[PDB]
């Protein structure tokens, strides 16, 4: 059965007026920013952007992958779409 959400994890993650974006849970960093209770860091594949969600916006990458995981014409899809698949845990910083 599920567990919640931990750092790590790999998901399609979803924000108003875009298609669900390959992402995964980051950790904090010592001394970094924490996000608001029951949100999440997220960190967007291609774009390299984080923000904070909550579960409701966050689905699992191996249930999801057969709906999501599809070429889009957006600025960093295509490139998080490579990342998540072949090196979902590197340091993109």
Same mark, same amino acid.
């Given at each position: +059965?599920? #567990?919640?959400? !931990?750092? =790590?994890?790999? *998901? /399609?993650? !979803? +924000? ?16 970094? *920013? ?8 997220? @960190? /967007? @594949? ?5 923000? /904070?969600? =909550?579960?409701?916006?966050? /689905?699992?990458?191996? !249930?999801? !992958? ?9 600025? =960093? @899809?295509?490139? =998080? ?7 979902? #845990?590197?340091?993109?910083?």
């Amino acid at each position: +059965m599920p #567990h919640a959400f !931990k750092p =790590g994890d790999l *998901v /399609f993650a !979803k +924000m108003k007026g875009y298609p669900h974006w390959p992402a995964r849970i980051d950790d904090i960093a010592d001394g970094a *920013v924490k996000p608001p209770p029951n949100k999440y860091p997220i @960190f /967007f @594949f291609g774009t390299h952007e984080t923000a /904070f969600l =909550g579960p409701k916006d966050l /689905f699992p990458y191996d !249930k999801s !992958k057969d709906k999501y995981g599809k070429p889009n014409k957006r600025k =960093g @899809f295509n490139e =998080g779409l490579w990342e998540i698949q072949n090196n979902p #845990h590197a340091s993109y910083s």
